[PDB]
Design a protein around this ligand. Sequence first.
Ligand code: P7F
Ligand code: BOG
Length: 261
Amino acid sequence: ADLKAFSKHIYNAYLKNFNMTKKKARSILTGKTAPFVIHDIETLWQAEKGLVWGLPPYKEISVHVFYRCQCTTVETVRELTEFAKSIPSFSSLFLNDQVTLLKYGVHEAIFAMLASIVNKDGLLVANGSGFVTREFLRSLRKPFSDIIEPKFEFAVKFNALELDDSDLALFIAAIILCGDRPGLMNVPRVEAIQDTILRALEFHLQANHPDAQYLFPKLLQKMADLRQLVTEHAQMMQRIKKTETETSLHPLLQEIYKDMY
Ligand SMILES: CC[C@@H](Oc1cccc(CN(CCCOc2ccc(OC)cc2)c2nc3ccccc3o2)c1)C(=O)O
Ligand SMILES: CCCCCCCCO[C@@H]1O[C@H](CO)[C@@H](O)[C@H](O)[C@H]1O
């Protein structure tokens, strides 16, 4: 009862704050308008010249994709921040504790939600109006071609669990409310909120996925998988900042990756 309403509150905060939902994504990816496919240089250009679509000064094809990728991340961080403010008691934390949770949590949540817009062949872009192929991303020059590929591997496995948006709302909330983030001041308070979230998640999963047996423990493992995925992503990003000294890294991403792990 308490948990059912708590889950509903989180769900509505999710629907309120995220422009792209899995319901919308799967509808686009299954055909019910069709996205413009971006599979090489020429189609990427066509996607820029109206159709589908501010950025740093143009450098090259691979850096351009890198820049558009960052812009989308920054926008999703804005959404996750507003979503977190609706998680009961998150706003009661001191401001720097809120930032600490978002700093170490947003990319874990981003990569979880990324699975919603992905299939084995590519992912939606531009609010679902475009589709960039996995192959085209593989064809970019290193190191940029190695950024997104490992996320496809996680996403395909994650999509096998067949979560819906109501499940994901609680899942993302549990990711953000994480008591072991470095520098967190009020660990007991954050652990207490997370426990409420996780209890609501188990209650919600058995009501929404009755025939799903080990779904809750599987999602706990997914949370651990996302932390290592992000650790390896932070390494790549920290490397690229050192290697690609002429490519711009958005200030928000610089701050997120600042001595992270
Ligand atoms: C770069 C540094 C960046 O790493 C990454 C690595 C992998 C994935 C992301 C986040 N992401 C980008 C998808 C593709 O992004 C494009 C965009 C345009 C394009 O070609 C024109 C090709 C790829 C995303 N979208 C979402 C939509 C809904 C929900 C969650 C979403 O998560 C960031 C970081 O560290 O933040
Ligand atoms: C309060 C606003 C936060 C941004 C402050 C400075 C923004 C500097 O410029 C940023 O560089 C990024 C590099 O990819 C671009 O992608 C961004 O679109 C651009 O705004």
